[PDB]
Amino acid sequence: DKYDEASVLFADIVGFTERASSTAPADLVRFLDRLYSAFDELVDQHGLEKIEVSGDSYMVVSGVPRPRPDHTQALADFALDMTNVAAQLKDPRGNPVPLRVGLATGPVVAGVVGSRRFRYCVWGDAVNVASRMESTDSVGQIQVPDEVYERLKDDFVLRERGHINVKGKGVMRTWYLIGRKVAA
Known part of the structure; x- marks a missing residue:
């Protein structure tokens, strides 16, 4: 088990029946389930794996066993295909794209509990604050925090959003949205 620091991604659609x-x-x-079946196939790209899932929720952490310096940039480009891929499938049956994505980074610890329950899980300060970004999202775009906003190395375009209402943090913070990756 390690502590250090890692980035986490959280995703969930509100247009699920x-x-x-x-x-x-x-x-x-079954058509919506066929969309998510294309996400796991497209997983093979970098150090990413599915961890926890209760129902229709989908969240991927970058804190895989083998950590890379650019762990924040590994999900930053991965969140650009989350909307791009889920846009080609329209016919048949016309369905919009109300997918909500939330990002966050910080301290992440490995679970792995011996006996009593068969599970590996993922917990930490970052994993807790990656969910509120999803639950409280407008239009249907990706919500990025200040933490991730500091890890961009002049290679990403971010647009300011503002402040809303929170109960967990207490004090609101400025949020951003990732548009596209800067490529010269």
Whole structure:
């Protein structure tokens, strides 16, 4: 188990049988599941692996066993394909893209609990603050914090958002949104 520092990504769609659908066993909850089935296949690129998942939530940490200096930049470009890929599939059945993505970085510790329960999990200060970014997101874009905003090395475009309302942190902080990666 290690402590150090790592970046974490959190993702979840609000358009998962909650809008105005009647709920059907056929076609429904199968085309959306086919989208997420394309994300795990596209995983093979860098040091990334799926950790925790209760229901329809999807979160990936960069704190994999083998850590790289550019762990913050590994998810920064990965979040650009999260929206790009989930945009080609439209026909048949017209569905919008209300996908909400939230980023965060900081101290991350490995779980791995012996006996009593078969699980590896992931916990830390960063993992806790990566969820609130998702739950409280407008339009349907990626929400980046100040921490990740400091790790860009003049290679990423970020736009200021502002402040909202929080209960966990208490004091609100300036948030940003990643548009595209700077490539000369």
